[PDB]
Design an enzyme around this catalytic site. Sequence first.
Site, PDB file in Angstrom:
ATOM      1  N   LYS A 292       0.832  -1.191   0.000  1.00 36.52           N
ATOM      2  CA  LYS A 292       0.000   0.000   0.000  1.00 36.52           C
ATOM      3  C   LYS A 292       0.868   1.243   0.000  1.00 36.52           C
ATOM      4  O   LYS A 292       0.725   2.106  -0.870  1.00 36.52           O
ATOM      5  CB  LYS A 292      -0.947  -0.017   1.199  1.00 36.52           C
TER       6      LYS A 292
ATOM      7  N   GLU B  77       1.881   7.759   9.988  1.00 37.42           N
ATOM      8  CA  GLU B  77       2.830   7.087   9.123  1.00 37.42           C
ATOM      9  C   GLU B  77       4.179   7.025   9.820  1.00 37.42           C
ATOM     10  O   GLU B  77       4.320   7.388  10.990  1.00 37.42           O
ATOM     11  CB  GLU B  77       2.951   7.801   7.774  1.00 37.42           C
ATOM     12  N   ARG B  78       5.172   6.531   9.086  1.00 35.76           N
ATOM     13  CA  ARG B  78       6.524   6.458   9.615  1.00 35.76           C
ATOM     14  C   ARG B  78       7.230   7.795   9.458  1.00 35.76           C
ATOM     15  O   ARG B  78       7.107   8.467   8.431  1.00 35.76           O
ATOM     16  CB  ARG B  78       7.317   5.362   8.901  1.00 35.76           C
TER      17      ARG B  78
END
Lengths: 161, 161, 53, 53, 495, 62
Positions: free
Chosen positions: B5, B31-32
């Site tokens: 994804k 998110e990261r």
Amino acid sequence: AGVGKTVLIMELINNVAKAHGGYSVFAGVGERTREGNDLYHEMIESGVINLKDATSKVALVYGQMNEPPGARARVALTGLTVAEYFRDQEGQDVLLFIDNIFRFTQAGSEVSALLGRIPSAVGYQPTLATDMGTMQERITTTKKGSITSVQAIYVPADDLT
Amino acid sequence: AGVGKTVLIMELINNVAKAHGGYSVFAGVGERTREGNDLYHEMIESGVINLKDATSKVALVYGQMNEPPGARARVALTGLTVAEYFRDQEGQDVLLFIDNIFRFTQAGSEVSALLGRIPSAVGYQPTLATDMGTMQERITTTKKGSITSVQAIYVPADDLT
Amino acid sequence: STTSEQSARMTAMDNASKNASEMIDKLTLTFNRTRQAVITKELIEIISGAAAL
Amino acid sequence: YYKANVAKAGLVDDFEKKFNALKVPIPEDKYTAQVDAEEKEDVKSCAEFLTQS
Amino acid sequence: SSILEERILGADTSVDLEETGRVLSIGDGIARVHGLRNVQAEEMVEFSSGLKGMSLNLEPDNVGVVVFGNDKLIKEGDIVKRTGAIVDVPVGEELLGRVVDALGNAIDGKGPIGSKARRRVGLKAPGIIPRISVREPMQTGIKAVDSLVPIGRGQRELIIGDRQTGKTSIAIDTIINQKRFNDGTDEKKKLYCIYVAIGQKRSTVAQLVKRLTDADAMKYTIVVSATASDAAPLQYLAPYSGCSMGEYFRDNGKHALIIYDDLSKQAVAYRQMSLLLRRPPGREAYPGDVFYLHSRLLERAAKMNDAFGGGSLTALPVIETQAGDVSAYIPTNVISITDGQIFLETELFYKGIRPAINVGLSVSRVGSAAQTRAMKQVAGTMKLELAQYREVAAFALDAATQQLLSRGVRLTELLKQGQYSPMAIEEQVAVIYAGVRGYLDKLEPSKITKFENAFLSHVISQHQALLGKIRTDGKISEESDAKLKEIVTNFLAGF
Amino acid sequence: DPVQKLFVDKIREYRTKRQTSGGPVDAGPEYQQDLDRELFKLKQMYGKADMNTFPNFTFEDP
């Protein structure tokens, strides 16, 4: 059932008393009174049990299933203290024939119910796992002694999950 | 999740947005931080974001998982209004890449129970569904501009329903 | 050819039984999964309903 | 080191001294028999070869 | 005698101005108490029970209490000293060479590592500044694993396994790999890495510490304990404990990593926590924040660039592949929060093939980035051919397929390894070319492991200097390659 | 410590027992039994071997 389970248990008791010199501890929480008297007679027959002879190679207890688990559950730490008495307080290695863990699971579940506790996903106490490990953890091969656990893994629908 | 994804969305971003002309957006929410660092390290050098100029008309947005979900619970309408400012106020080919959509309703529920009221079965707010849906009603290319939106719905446990 | 046929049917059934046990493996896996899943699902439903009370 | 570390301090030093005195038994060797066998075999084989060959 | 007096001597008891919070509501380990509002949030305040608690939830009229202790040893009404001091750990690597609890309680004895600085454990995620590409190859000591997925310093990884699934064996091998690494004089090679156990048995962890004593890896190691006895906050804090523990040395410029196992444990802890909170969580008893809860520790996987002094904070999660049920919302987040994951196969281990990484299922996007490129050349095609042999293993009489079959046979016979066998990528690149050579494909894959031990011994003996040469060969030296083919034939004779 | 009369009594008891140690300062007989059991344990641990008995192996080969 009929799998030598009582037979193997007695075999273990004899092998501990002879092959290890260690006696045994019986705590049958929620034991059938029929099964209770049967075990009394049978263990007496095995000779490792005698309420008078003072040469029995074990210590005995059984529990009332008909009784509320709020009674039936606490026998755990009782047997724990007993093991301490025989091992930490009496310098020995020991095991503990205990049936059944899933029975102990249901006991803790009813306990949480008493807490009005949001039950576990398996309905257990929200941290029933805490005691369950503690149940495992309360006995160990510590310097105090080699606390062994003869664990009856009552297969809830044989559902390991 | 782990579906590529991020990987697939990024490759698709490369491919299609290689000619993304209007003021454009990419949003890593929940998110990261590494994801944002790489996104910048790419885009700035990619010239879609200008590594030394103001040509970052294609930009990456960081709502990385470092925030509280409630902290995370606000990026969406920011992106929507910003896209209004880019396209609706200019009518150019505006683009939007967004993730993770699952995290959006995840926060919405996470505060919905935290709202001290009875939450959904999945714990969302009673109109958390409406919150997202109308958010989509505001998320479209309009008479005032041309904004293109890409949403990444992390399949929650792949709960197909 | 008839002996070949009988042996082939046997081995075919064998491979089939292998595939069957294989399918049944994940089948039972997800089966207990969904079993406990619905169990606790109704459980959580009841829990919330109690919360509603 | 173990001296300062132990209460058996001068005991640790004295045991170091005793170990310097203490002796483990060294093994024994018989490569001489092997050497004689090797030399005689060299003799026999070389003679037979350089003769019959 | 007089020494006990001396201990009693110099006992310090200086007093200070302080009030406390008398408990009001007691039950289930959280006190909805009143007073001492002069305490702050995230603080570490302490009660009359001497237990120190973190800020639970300030009520408009009461005060909830969050502690990780046992209040059966605490009666209601007790005065809780409003310490108002953000829950903070010690700061510094004093635990290095020391085995402490999650709160610094070395239940292994070995005295206290009285870290002279206190880590404001309310640490937060690293940002974007140090957030840059990592470059340090991870001294894994796991032959195939490191071969399969080389890793970098600062990584956000994961690992999943079943009961007794070698995951602890994996960690022990990693620790073993750290000794010679920590023996590496350079701080990049020097492995001041971290390791914590979650919910483990105190005695099992004791056996682990016994191995470490055998390992002497405490030079490489500092132990923070979260046994089975851990309280729910205690397990919950344990991820935070390890995070701040890393933070001290990552901010001390350390290139290292932390090993907490297993994160799936405190999941039970947090679930029971919310349950005690009576707040309605979701499936898996899981409240929504569980990710963000997990993410709190998760984002700490910092490749701390020069923007953070060049330290490294690598993080690899440990959440059990419970029955290999990937569909766990817990596992769902678990892969979803890390930049990678270590999936471990069971069938191989069930077939006894140890190691048993889920070669099909395992994946880590680090690879040659921060990796020895020599083994990369020696074995990139090797990994590809392993994949093909699996594609060949996807069948049950092409002599091409047969050759691929023998190749996969050797590949499997080689890749795995036993427990506690630390080593560098040296023999890795060696056997990588060797199988990549495949000049032993004729040799029995059964005999492959034995002759492999043989060749390893041969290399360790003779080409040990040539091994140093290949180490110097920070590239595929055609000279080193020729020595390789030569000694390959040599050991082949020795076969 | 002088400011604290509690610390005063503490140092007092400390010196008191320290000097009292000429006699076993609160030896206790159960403590003696504990010392005996500990002796048994230290015997098992240190080994049945005499503590300072310097040994010799008298090795052999094939």
